[PDB]
């Protein structure tokens, strides 16, 4: 009942879908086993990795395939695109620079391939090692030139470091170069903010993914970023982490803090976040398959900057697909969420 | 002709009720002044506290200034901008981060003390929640009921954490006894995060009111939802402001995670519970939009908690804003549920 080819009068693009290497996956188990990893790999990498669970072990399995069984399972959800990165946390969390390097550029080479295999369904965007900011920015170059890549998620913090530091300069300034979009995806919280959540079970994508990243968004718009980088374009899923829900509170504490001189890093913008929002920010329902919340991002962003993500396959759901399908939206408001504000932000 | 009137006297159609409105102690002010000077304070307490204590700017100096005041000032305030009533309550972090047990109760006690001379004073205009220690649950219960039996108070407000301790820990089981026992609801309002969790935010700018108030405060009462304390206590009704800490706007991806960990077995903590987060919010949970006076936030979250469960609050005196009141006032609501959320709402939950 679900169809891909677009005979309901709209393409099923999905934004944010996943995909794992074995390679790396190993060593997150190393890392694990050897005491180096942090806790939230140690929570959400050793579940995954190891879990006897039927919705863990059939994680793993969908995440490291990239051909005919992940086009199966899209087929059979009536996806005819998919937007696929390196599931988080990439090669972030790696304290071996060479090793991170080396197994971001294989995983980038493995996802081209797959892309040139299947370029009508398979969309690639890159992943980096932000702990090389400059190296990085020759990824970020080859992925657009060399590899097709529509542009790079980054899966938050890496290493407890947030992009608003100068020192990952390079990567924005490289994005604008290109000319391509960041996806700002979650990772678990570093171990200077994880204790509390984790405790409680709370760390993951329940409730601490969206803290963690929506704390990444917030701060890079703080510091002017995109004063900085008026064209750059950085997604987030989840409905925008909060943001678009918070966005009275956010600016109006905002403002007091800047008027107030309270904080080193608050100083003046160009825009309210508001205006941020709606210039520079893009939202996907990665998760969130609800109307109320569709509708709500759709209103205060505008519903040009709404698409729509499946989060394959943490959340591989044919019944919220036809949930989307069902809204109560006009066709053409229908449209730009599943089909054309992808094409356009993602230059497809 | 509209008009900048903002007139007590509910002759809108309602009265308007504000149901988060703070209050400090000149004592309490200073132990936290004594904290920061002698190294004891969090940085949450630093960051906060040192700011409002000792900065110079225009709305710093303001704030305190008002806080402190219980008495014609806050009502010329009030009266100012049109609010007929307040619900008071010591401002954020009260007691809870103080190290010694005697002084918190002390404290505390006078807090209260003062609170209720105060609504005495002002039977029409102010109404009281107490204050407590729950580093101390067996002396906070038996504050629940002093203050709900003696001092006329409508429940207590918990300013989250209580030096990185959360209330889903079986320690703190007295205070939710009692709240039941004088069936009385707690508010959980915002406090800076624990040392444990707010270093990235205070680097940015973020732990307070704009970011960091959220995480603790949304953290805290899923904490508390997801260890099924409404099973456990069916009739407990916990408040929570700023729209509800973001948790309406989630709700889906919070169940769909919930029930993923449950089924999944993920974590020990994590067990089955008797209705989904969503019927918890339908019956357990009350919100209201302090800080955000926001339509379509407002109607978002009436939507998705019934409006019977969302109320107006100020905020005052860190969000002291006529024109929000005029904004509030002029929404797009009809007249039955722009009075529930003015008034009746707040009538019925705090028992007014
Ligand atoms: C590790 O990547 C993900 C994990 C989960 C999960 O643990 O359910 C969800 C999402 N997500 O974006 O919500 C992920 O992409
Ligand atoms: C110390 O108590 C508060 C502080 C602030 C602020 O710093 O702006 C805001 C709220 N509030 O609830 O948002 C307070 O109650
Ligand atoms: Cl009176
Ligand atoms: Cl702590
Ligand atoms: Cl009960
Ligand atoms: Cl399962
Ligand atoms: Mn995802
Ligand atoms: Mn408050």
Redo the contacts between chains.
């Keep these: 009942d679900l169809k891909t080819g677009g005979e309901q009068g709209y393409l099923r693009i999905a934004t944010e879908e996943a995909f794992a290497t074995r390679e790396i996956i190993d060593v997150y188990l190393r890392m694990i086993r050897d005491g180096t990893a942090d806790k939230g790999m140690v929570s959400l990498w050793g579940?995954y990795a190891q879990?006897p669970?039927?919705?863990?072990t059939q994680i793993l399995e969908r995440l490291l395939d990239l051909g005919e069984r992940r086009i199966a399972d899209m087929d059979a959800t009536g996806i005819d695109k998919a937007i696929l990165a390196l599931t988080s946390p990439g090669v972030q969390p790696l304290h071996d620079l060479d090793e991170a390097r080396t197994l971001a550029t294989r995983a980038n080479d493995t996802l081209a391939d797959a892309c040139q295999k299947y370029p009508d369904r398979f969309i690639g965007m890159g992943t980096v090692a932000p702990q090389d900011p400059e190296w990085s920015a020759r990824e970020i170059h080859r992925g657009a030139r060399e590899l097709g890549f529509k542009g790079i998620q980054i899966n938050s913090?890496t290493q407890?470091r947030?992009l608003?530091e100068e020192f990952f300069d390079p990567i924005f300034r490289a994005l604008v170069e290109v000319d391509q979009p960041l996806y700002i995806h979650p990772a678990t919280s570093?171990d200077?903010?994880?204790?509390?959540?984790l405790?409680?079970?709370?760390d993951?994508?329940?409730?601490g993914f969206?803290?963690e990243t929506?704390?990444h968004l917030?701060?890079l718009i703080?510091?002017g970023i995109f004063d900085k980088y008026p064209s750059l374009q950085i997604m987030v899923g989840?409905?925008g982490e909060?943001l678009?829900?918070?966005?009275?509170?956010?600016d109006?504490?905002?403002q007091?803090?800047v008027?107030?001189?309270?904080?080193?890093?608050?100083k003046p913008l160009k825009k309210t976040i508001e205006g941020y929002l709606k210039s520079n920010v893009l939202v996907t329902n990665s998760?969130?398959?609800?109307e109320?919340?569709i509708k709500?991002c759709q209103?205060?962003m505008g519903e040009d900057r709404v698409m729509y993500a499946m989060d394959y396959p943490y959340?591989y759901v044919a019944d919220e697909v036809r949930a989307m399908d069902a809204m109560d939206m006009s066709a053409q408001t229908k449209k730009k969420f599943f089909q054309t504000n992808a094409e356009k932000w993602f230059k497809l």
């Design positions: 579940f879990s669970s039927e919705r863990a913090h407890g947030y608003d570093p200077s903010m994880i204790d509390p959540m405790e409680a079970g709370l993951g994508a329940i409730f969206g803290v929506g704390m917030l701060r703080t510091i989840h409905m909060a678009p829900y918070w966005l009275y509170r956010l109006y504490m905002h007091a803090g008027r107030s001189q309270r904080y080193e890093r608050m998760g969130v398959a609800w109320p919340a709500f209103q205060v959340q």
